[PDB]
Amino acid sequence: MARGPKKHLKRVAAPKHWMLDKLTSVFAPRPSTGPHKLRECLPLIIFLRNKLKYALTGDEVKKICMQRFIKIDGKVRADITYPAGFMDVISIDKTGENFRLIYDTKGRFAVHRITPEEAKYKLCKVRKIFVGTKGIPHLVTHDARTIRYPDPLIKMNDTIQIDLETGKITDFIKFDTGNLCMVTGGANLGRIGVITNRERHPGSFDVVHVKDANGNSFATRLSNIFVIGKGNKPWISLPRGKGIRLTIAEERDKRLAAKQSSG
Amino acid sequence: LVTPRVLQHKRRRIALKKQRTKKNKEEAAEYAKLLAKRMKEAKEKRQEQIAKRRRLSSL
Amino acid sequence: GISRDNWHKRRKTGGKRKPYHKKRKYELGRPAANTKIGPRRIHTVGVRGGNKKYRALRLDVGNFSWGSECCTRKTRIIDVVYNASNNELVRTKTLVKNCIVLIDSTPYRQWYESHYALPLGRKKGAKLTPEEEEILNKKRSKKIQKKYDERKKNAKISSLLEEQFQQGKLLACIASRPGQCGRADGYVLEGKELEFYLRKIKARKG
Amino acid sequence: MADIQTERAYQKQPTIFQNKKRVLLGETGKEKLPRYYKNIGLGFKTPKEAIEGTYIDKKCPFTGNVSIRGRILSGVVTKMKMQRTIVIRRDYLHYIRKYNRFEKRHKNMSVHLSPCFRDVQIGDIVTVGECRPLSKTVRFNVLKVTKAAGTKKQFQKF
RNA sequence: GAAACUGCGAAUGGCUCAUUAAAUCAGUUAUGGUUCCUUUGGUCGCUCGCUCCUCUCCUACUUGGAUAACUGUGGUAAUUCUAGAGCUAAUACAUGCCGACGGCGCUGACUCCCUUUGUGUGGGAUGCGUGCAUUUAUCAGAUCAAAACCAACCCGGUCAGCGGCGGCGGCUUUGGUGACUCUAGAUAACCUCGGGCCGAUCGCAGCCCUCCGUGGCGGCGACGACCCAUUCGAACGUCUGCCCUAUCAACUUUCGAUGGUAGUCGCCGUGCCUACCAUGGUGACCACGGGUGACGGGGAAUCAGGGUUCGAUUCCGGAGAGGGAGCCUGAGAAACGGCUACCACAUCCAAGGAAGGCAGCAGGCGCGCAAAUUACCCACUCCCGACCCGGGGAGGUAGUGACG
RNA sequence: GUUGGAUCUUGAGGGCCCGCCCCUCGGCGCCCCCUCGAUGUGUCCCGCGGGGCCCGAAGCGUUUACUUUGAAAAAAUUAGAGUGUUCAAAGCAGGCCCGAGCCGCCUGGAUACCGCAGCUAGGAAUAAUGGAAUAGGACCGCGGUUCUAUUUUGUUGGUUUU
To answer: Where does the record place the modification N6-acetyllysine (chain C)?
Structure first.
C-alpha cells in the first residue's frame, strides 16, 4: 500500500542543493504546493533561519510568519514552507531589504541582495502561450502566472517582465540568438552565458549549444536553459562564486586566501 | 436579518462585480489600440510580398 | 469488485500471469445501464476521480439532426429496427450506440415546407388537406417575388429524403452512448448509408 | 480500396459526411465520400494507398485518429499469417562485460499492419513506430515498409 | 466560553517483507488514452431584453422549514448500544430576487426611390433564437506560377456599357504542435428533473447624501461556488536488465488463446467484456511447466587485477496489515487504532444477545542458538487542524546494550 | 549454433599542423527583392540580410556495430577536496576583529562514479553491409500522347494552353 500521496519528506532524501545537513535531523521542511516543482524549490524556513539565521527553533519560525513582515513577489505570505523558486524575490518590509534567489555555479542558492528598483520586476520565460477559451489569448509563465491579453507578436521562449506592484506584462524581451541565459540543473548548474546556436531536432528533446563567458562550450537540453534577458545586458547582477564557472583548484586558492584575512 | 452590516456587505458584493466588468472592458479596449496600430507597420508587409512574387516569376 | 486489469490472463507465450496486488476501487467496472424504450428517467452517478456520469434507465426521446439542412429537432424514438452490434439488442429493444431507430418524419418536413415556403411534394392525403396548401399559397402578399428569386431548385429535396417522408418515419443512427451520455442523439440516415442499412434489414429478415 | 459494406456496418471518417443539398439523389459518394488523408511527420510521407483507400481500418496513422509518438524501431518480418497483423523479429545486442564478448538476443513482437501497405511479404524490412496500445499484444503500427538492398531483385532486364 | 453542528485531517504516519520470476522493481521513455482536493496565477453583475416574464416573475431593506447540543421522560444481564417527547441555529439543508435605459439573425404585416411592375438599391414593426457548460449535427480551420477570349458585375483612363455594364487593366484579407477531424469561429438546437453553473455568507473598519435613513461606494480578509492552468500525484503504455531446473520439450481458447470489426463498460487506452468474423500467438536465442527463507533498487563484505558473495534490516519504490470476498465516505482508500458477510481464531453473556484484530509503541505468551523500558516528553526535528497557541509510541529523551 | 580467404585513391605557413587530391545553412556564382559601392517599389560588382537554383564544402554514395564528445544521469553510502570533532570513530562545520556601540568582516558544506538500452556528436581503421548481366544509373539531354492540382488575365463561371 500507498493509498494516497505523502505529506511528509524525510531528510537525507531531500535535494542536495538546498544545503541541509545529513542525519542530525530526521525530517526536512518539504515545500508546500505552489507555482514551482518541489525539486527546484527552497522552503522559506531554510532561507530565513539556516542562511539568514533569525530563528533557533521552529516555534519562532511560525511566530515570525504571523507578523506578516514578509512579502514574496509583492504579495503577503504567511506560509512557513513557501515554495520559492528561480528569480523569486523575497521582500522584508521591516528592514527594506530585497533578496532574490539565483544559482551559484557552485550549485548553492545565493543570498543576493538587490535594490528595490530591481525588485519591482522579474523576468519570466514563457512556458506556453495559449489561445484560450472564446478566442482570448493568454501567456503562461514558468511560475504559473497567466496574464490575459498579452503583446500580439510574442512567440515561445520569450521573456517577459512581470511586475509585482500591479501584475501584468510591463514590456517584454524578444527571444533571439546570443541572449543571456542561465543554465539551471544538470552538470551545467548555475553557469551563465550567451546562446550561439539552438539545434532543432523534430520529435522530443532539442538541444541548445551554449558558450559561457569564459569560452567553455557545452550543450544542454532546451528545458535546462532559462532565458534571463537580452544578450550582454544583465538585469540582475552576478552572484558569488563567479556564477560563471570556476575550477576546484582556483576555488581552493580563493578559500584559503580570503580566510584569516577578514576581520 | 438585514442590518447595516448586511447592507454594506451586499454593496461590497455588487461593487466588486461592477469593478471586475469595467476592468475587462478597459484591458480589451487598450489591447485593441495596440493590435490596430501594429497593423500599419506589420501587416502592410504583405503587399510588398505579393508584388515581389510577380517580379521573380518574370524571369 | 467487477474488474478490469491487465495483470491477469494468458501471455503471448501461452504462459499465465500471477496476480499483482489485490482488487482496488479504481478497477471498478460497474454493470450496464440496460436502457431501453419507455418513459424517461436518468440518474446522476458519482464516479471515480469525482465528476458525474449519467446513467439512463429508459429513454424515449432524442435530439436527431438533419445533417443536409444543418438543423436538429427533438423527436420520439419509437423502436429499434436494426443494430449491427448484436441482433438480440434489436429484439430486446435495448438502445445502444449505432442503433438504427425510427423518428417522426413530420417535424423535419414541417420545418422544410415552412422555411423554404414551398412543399416537397405530397406526403399523404391526410397531411395535405389542412395545411401544406396554406404554405403553397404563402402569407407573403408582397415578397412573393423575393421567395422565388431566393429559392431556386426548391419545391423539392433529395430523392432518399422524399422516400422516407412517404413511409411516415425516417431512419436515423444513434451517434452517442445512451447509457453513459444519457442522450440518445444521432443523425438522420441519408444517401449510401441508408441504402446499405435497408439492404441489411431485408437480408436478416425472412 | 476495400469496401466498408463488407462487414455489416457502414462507416464514415470524422467530419466527412453527406450533404446531398437541394439537388436530387446523392451523395451516395463515388468513392464513398471524400477520402481524407493527413501526414504523421518524422520523415514519413503519406503514400498513394491512403488516398486510394476507403477501408474500415482506423489504426492507420494516415487516415485514423491514432497518434504516433515515442520510439521508432525497425525489424524484419518473421511471419505474415492472418490479416491486418504481422510478426516482426527485433534483433538487439545485450551487452555483457563479464565475459569479454557479448551476445545477440531477440524478441518477436506482434505489430499491426495497415491496409495502407499492400504488396508486402515475409523477409521484408519494416519500420514501425510507437503508439498507444491498439490491442492487447500490439503496441505498434507499421509506418513504412521499406525495400532496400541486400534483398535484391534489383538486377533485372525487364 | 465547556459543549454541539459545520468544514478539514483520519488514504498520510508508523510497521513488516509473507506474497509475487518480466510479475514486483530499476533505469530510460509516454499520456495526442486520462483523473486530480489543495496551493499559486487568471476566471466572479445579465436572463447578452423569451425583438424584458427578470418595469408586471413586485421577497431584495433577504424566502422556506428541521435536528443536534439543551431540557425532560426512558429502555437494555451486558454495547464508543440507543427510543420517545418539548425546543431550536447556520458558510448545514431546499429555494429564489432587485438588474440592458445603448443584445442579436433570418423568416416577415411590409414601406421609400430609380429602370412601370418585371429587375435593382434601401430599411423594417409583429414572432422566435442572442452567458457559459453539457450533448448532437454541419460548415470552418483560406495558405503554391502565367495568359487570349466569352457569360455574369466592382472601380479608374476613354466609350463600341451610355462605371445600371460590353470592350483594356487593378488592389486579392486566419492561432499551435514533429504529427490530431488540435485551438478558435459560424449556423441549428438539445437538457440534467430532488439530479449543470452564474454568492440569499461573514468579520474588520473607513464614506457621501439638492437630506436625514434611505439608497448608493472605498480598503483590509474570511469562506463557498464555476472554469482553465499549476503543484502533490495517480492508472496504464516504450525499451533494456533478474535465481535454479530437460529425471520439465512443445505450449496457449471452449469458461478468449492471438487478431479484425462494432458495441457494452471503465477516471481514461485495451479481448476490459461481448456479439460476429478470422486462425492466430509462442518456443532449442530454453519458451511452456516446476522449484524458491524470490520483495526490488541505491547500496554492503572480500578479491593483485579478473572476480565471488550479500541486500527483511536508518533511504527510495512496490506489496500486505488473522485469511478471503464485497462496500461506504472522499479529489485520493477496496482502509482492520472504518464497515459488512463468511472462514479460521479469541472475548463477554443473566443465554435473548453483544462487541474484536499489536507484520503500531511498550509488554506478555509461544518459538528458538538469538534480540531491550509494561519508563519520561511534545522542548527539539517535522506533520496535521479552524491553528503561533492544540494533539502526536511520528519523533525526541533516558534505561537495557563487550553486535561492532 | 558458433566460426570463416584475398581485393575498392586523400602543395603551401611556421618550426608536427591544416582543408584537398591520381540548399533548412554557409557560400564560388547565376537570377529576385529592401538594395551595398556605378544608384538612393530601385542596377550591371552580390546573396553579403531574407530567397530560389547550385559548386570547393556538404546529406553526397548503402547500412551499422565499435570507438569518441555531450546531455539525461537520487541524497546518504563510497572514493575524495575544504574544514584543528583535544587524537579518533565521526560531524559539516568555521575563522577573525571590536571593551560589549566593530551596533561588525568573512570562507564553506568541492569534485568523481552510474547494469544496460535509448538520446546527441566526431571518426572511418577493424568486423559485417551496399550495387549494372539477356541493363542500369546519372545531367531541365528531348519529343508525341493523356491527366490532375492551383497561381494568374479585378472578381466568379466556360473554353485553350503554359
So the answer is: 36, 127
**Residue C41 one-letter amino acid:** R
- Is A163 in contact with A116 (CB distance < 8 Å)? no
State the burial class of residue D39 (Cβ atoms within 10 Å of its Cβ: 0-12, 13-18, 19+).
Answer: exposed
Cell digits of residue C92: 430486446
Sheet-wide strand order for A207-212: A217-221, A207-212, A191-198, A181-183, A225-227
Residue A113: enclosing H or E segment and its boundaries? strand A112-114
Residues in chain A preceding a C-to-N separation beyond 2.5 angstroms (breaks): none
Same domain assignment for residues C40 and C62: yes
Which nt sits closest to B24, CA to C1'? E43
Cα dist. D33→D4, D29, D43, D54, D91 in Å?
12, 5, 29, 9, 43
Each domain of chain A, given as residue ranges in start order, spans 2-117, 122-172, 175-245
C137 contact to strand E (CB, 7 A limit): no
Which of the nucleotides in strand F have any atom less than 7 Å away from a protein CB atom? 2, 31-33, 41-42, 50-51, 62, 65-66, 70-77, 81-83, 91-97, 104-112, 115-121, 129-136
CATH class (in words) of the domain with range A2-117: alpha beta
Q: For the structural domain made of D2-152, what CATH number should be given?
A: 2.40.50.1000
Instruction: Please tell me whether residues C154 and C177 are part of one structural domain.
Output: no
* Number of residues that make up chain C: 206
Non-local CB neighbours of B59 within 8 Å, separated by 6+ positions = none
Domains of chain D, residue spans: 2-152
CA nearest to D7 within chain C: C84
Let me know whether C132 and C185 are in one domain.
no
Residues 6+ apart with CB under 8 A from A244: A105, A191, A192, A193, A212, A213, A214, A238
Does the domain spanning A122-172 belong to CATH 3.10.560.10? no
Report CB contact under 8 Å: C193, D8.
no
Nearest partner of A101 among A164, A17, A170, judged by Cα:
A17
CA angle, A242 then A245 then A247, to 5°: 105
Q: Mind telling me how many Å the CA of B16 is from chain A's nearest CA? A: 17
Residues C188 and C95 in one domain: yes
- Report chain D residues whose CB lies below 8 A from the CB of C159: 24-25
Method used for this model? Answer: cryo-EM
In order of A16, A126, C25, C29, the CA distances from C20 in angstroms are 35, 42, 15, 18
Q: Could you give the number of structural domains in chain C? A: 3
A203: nearest CA partner in chain D:
D42
Put simply, whether D148 touches A (Cβ < 8 Å) is no
Cell of C26: 479504481
Question: Where in the sequence is the domain holding C8, given as residue range(s)?
Answer: 1-30
